[PDB]
Amino acid sequence: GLIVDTRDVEERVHVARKTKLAPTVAHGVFNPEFGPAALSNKDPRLNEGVVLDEVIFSKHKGDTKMSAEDKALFRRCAADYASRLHSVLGTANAPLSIYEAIKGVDGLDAMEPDTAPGLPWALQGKRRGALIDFENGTVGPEVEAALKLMEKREYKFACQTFLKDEIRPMEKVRAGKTRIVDVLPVEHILYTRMMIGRFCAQMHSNNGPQIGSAVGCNPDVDWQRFGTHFAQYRNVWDVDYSAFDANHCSDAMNIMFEEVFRTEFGFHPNAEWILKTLVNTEHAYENKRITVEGGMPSGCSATSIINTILNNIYVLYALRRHYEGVELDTYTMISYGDDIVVASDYDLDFEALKPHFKSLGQTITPADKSDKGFVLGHSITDVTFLKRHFHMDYGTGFYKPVMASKTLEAILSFARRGTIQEKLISVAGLAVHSGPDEYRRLFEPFQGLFEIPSYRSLYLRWVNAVCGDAAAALEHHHHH
Q: Is 29 exposed, middle or buried (0-12, 13-18, 19+ CB in 10 A)?
A: middle
Identify the CATH assignment for 404-480 out of 2.60.120.10, 1.20.960.20, 1.25.50.10, 3.90.1150.10: 1.20.960.20
Of the candidates 89, 72, 90, 80, the residue with the CA atom closest to the CA atom of residue 331: 80
Residue 362 C-alpha from the chain's centroid: 17
Residue 267 C-alpha from the chain's centroid: 24
SS3 for 247-264, per residue? CCCHHHHHHHHHHHCCHH
Measured distance CA(219)–CA(298) in Å, rounded: 23
Identify the CATH assignment for 208-248+303-403 out of 3.30.70.270, 3.40.50.300, 3.90.1150.10, 3.30.70.1110: 3.30.70.270
Measured distance CA(324)–CA(216) in Å, rounded: 34
Cα dist from 101 to 97, 154, 271, 283, whole Å: 6, 21, 14, 25
Q: Is 124 helix (H, G, I), strand (E, B) or coil?
A: helix
Measured distance CA(108)–CA(115) in Å, rounded: 17
Measured distance CA(252)–CA(408) in Å, rounded: 36
Q: Cβ atoms within 10 A of the Cβ of 477, count?
A: 6
Measured distance CA(367)–CA(331) in Å, rounded: 19
The per-residue DSSP string of 161-181 comes to EEE---EEEHHHHHTT---EE
* All structural domains of the chain with their residue ranges: 1-207+249-302, 208-248+303-403, 404-480
338 flagged as catalytic: yes
Which residue in 43, 70, 238, 338 is the catalytic one? 338
Q: Resolution, in Å, please?
A: 2.3
